[PDB]
């Protein structure tokens with residue numbers, strides 16, 4: 001029993017973090033096989049960031065412009081290229097700790113584990129959702145750039161995020177491991193800001209199912225709803241519209257609890273309209289949206305507490 | 307910026323988890339040097355748990371009664387002893403991945419990282435406070451026994467918890483790595499229950515300081531309080547009394563923010579009396595108590611956003 005914001009074990013990623021220095025600038029890189037990946041802003045001075053031309057800043061660098069430090073060990077850079085907003089450094093040594101891995105672009109509303117790192121040394125691990133507005137509510141200080149996000153499935157690490165930026169509201173922006181930004185953001189100084197955000201409806205429903213699996217039904221009701229009637233309420237409360245695809249995804253949690261998805265929607269409508277009346281669900285006074293249906297099945301018992 | 311329930315990176319602990327089997331019963335052990343530590347209830351059948359005599363159950367076992375599996379590899383057991391509620395198995399092989407480590411008994415209100423494990427395989431990591439009633443609000447299923455808690459400081463792992471039990475309220479109980487239970491709990495079937503709990507006052511104050519370091523002052527006021535006047539309010543709201551020792555511990559956070567500890571107490575009193583009036587602090591609608599003053603200094607900027 002219990003329900004916690006649980007991260008994946010971080011060992012397989014720890015063995016891949018290095019430090020990358022170009023001139024005065026140090027940040028984190030990810031060392032897989034004989035490649036190191038890091039944010040391309042490592043090549044900029046503070047003043048370069050106002051209006052950088054990366055193509056023109058990079059052609060002025062050699063391989064030996066880059067220092068890569070793996071723990072105590074200097075890795076020799078023997079090649080470099082830019083891929084979107086990442087630099088790829090080829091080094092003289094294959095990482096003996098390279099895990100089984102893939103690069104994936106996660107979708108909005110999906111979750112991942114962040115390994116915050118400074119100076120190539122891992123400092124902490126926590127779980128993040130990709131918000132609908134393509135930001136994450138992370139915890140990052142200066143020096144954290146090149147920290148990665150990931151998911152693990154049967155000893156394969158799916159890398160999905162590299163940290164580039166803190167926006168003016170204190171939320172975080174970065175790239176997939178092909179160096180494409182999540183959201184409309186750019187690695188230069190602009191008036192860019194987090195767009196308006198929404199509550200991840202599918203995740204709230206998964207988390208209500210979690211509460212029932214763990215033995216709590218106080219918030220259920222004798223009502224049902226159409227998808228249309230639910231969505232009129234969702235819009236009022238700045239919830240993402242529910243789609244048939246989202247109903248289909250909730251099929252296994254619905255089956256394990258015997259609560260029809262639209263019967264759970266009727267419960268959520270009533271909670272949005274009436275509040276929680278001083279009660280909690282899984283310890284929370286608020287409706288939680290940072291757990292996916294996959295996260296609930298991973299962490300909850302396969303046997304409902306009936 | 308940001309503020310997250312952050313766990314330590316779990317790699318150094320992952321390399322120590324093994325599986326321990328005695329008959330039908332499998333659970334997790336911790337492999338350091340040539341010793342494996344696990345809950346002594348591994349030697350019990352389900353029916354043994356009603357009234358076990360561990361001394362009498364253990365003398366009936368040989369070394370070869372115990373199977374220890376480190377990944378793919380069988381470790382041969384060559385010795386065994388009981389230490390309080392732990393078994394210590396000596397094995398034929400020293401763990402090549404043994405980190406620098408110590409065994410520590412944490413105090414109530416202190417935090418640690420839990421590596422949930424099943425069948426010797428790590429599944430997840432999250433941060434826990436030791437509640438005043440000596441329980442943790444974990445997330446554990448059947449098979450999780452022998453999962454450990456820890457803190458890391460400069461590459462030294464301080465192990466402080468081993469998981470033994472889920473209480474009837476769904477909260478968790480275990481031992482230090484000398485096998486002494488936290489709290490009044492026992493590794494046998496009784497009417498035992500979590501005692502009443504309290505809010506960890508020192509941690510709430512640390513977390514208000516965190517909010518100011520990250521740039522928020524909405525909840526401050528022009529009032530001060532005596533320790534006595536604060537504690538009359540604390541008792542009304544089921545908060546731990548504040549002591550002079552707790553005021554002294556908050557000295558560095560008070561210095562970094564320029565807010566006197568008793569001026570912060572006056573702010574907390576006002577929040578307890580009046581509520582938050584629909585506002586948040588660091589994203590929360592409630593007063594958070596699972597971050598220590600050490601956790602705040604670890605995660606927050608050393609420069610206040612003034």
Ligand SMILES: O=C(Cn1nnc2ccccc21)N(Cc1ccsc1)c1ccc(-c2cn[nH]c2)cc1
Nearest residue numbers: 044045046049140141142164165166187188189307
């Ligand atoms: O946001 C950042 C870097 N960053 N990421 N996470 C942070 C958490 C706290 C503080 C700073 C943090 N920026 C701002 C910028 C400006 C144009 S795009 C993004 C940033 C600031 C300075 C540099 C820099 C490059 N060379 N020297 C300094 C890079 C990124």
Ligand SMILES: O=C(Cn1nnc2ccccc21)N(Cc1ccsc1)c1ccc(-c2cn[nH]c2)cc1
Nearest residue numbers: 001350351352355446447448470471472493494495
């Ligand atoms: O609580 C447990 C074991 N445990 N720990 N975390 C749990 C999370 C979910 C389910 C069970 C969990 N107990 C109960 C008991 C009974 C007397 S003291 C503690 C437990 C239940 C069964 C065994 C057992 C021993 N041999 N075979 C079964 C051990 C502990």
